[PDB]
Ligand binder design. Structure first.
Ligand code: HEM
Length: 94
């Protein structure tokens, strides 16, 4: 296609099992499937939610700017323009 990798909530929510753990973090989508162990913090903490707004979780901990750039290195594509009129996504806080 010509657009980026705009993926929908349902699709991303399917990328959280078997051995594909995605997370949506801000207005973009990140594959961390080969970052699980590599993540300086762990797999489990990262796979805890998966395929949902982990933004709240990521922002709770805040993260250093290193992570904000390294995040871009994991950028597969973006959150579909569908759920963009309402970025608001009430989910688990933890
Ligand atoms: C874009 C995806 C992410 C990247 C690239 C990333 C990167 C990093 C990096 C570089 C660190 C080391 C601390 C620092 O930033 O200076 C870190 C630590 C950590 N991250 Fe992430 N992270 C991501 C997503 C997440 C998410 C969604 C969670 C929560 C569900 C999480 C939980 C943690 C925790 C708990 C630590 C601290 C470990 C500890 O001190 O015990 N991270 N992350």
């Amino acid at each position: 296609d010509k657009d980026v990798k705009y993926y929908t909530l349902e699709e991303i929510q399917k990328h959280k099992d078997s051995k594909s753990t995605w997370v949506i973090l801000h207005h973009k989508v990140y594959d961390l499937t080969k970052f699980l162990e590599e993540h300086p913090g762990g797999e489990e903490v990262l796979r805890e939610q998966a395929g949902g707004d982990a933004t709240e979780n990521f922002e709770d901990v805040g993260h250093s700017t290193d992570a904000r750039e390294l995040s871009k290195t994991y950028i597969i594509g973006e959150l579909h323009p569908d759920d963009r009129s309402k970025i608001a996504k009430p989910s688990e806080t933890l």
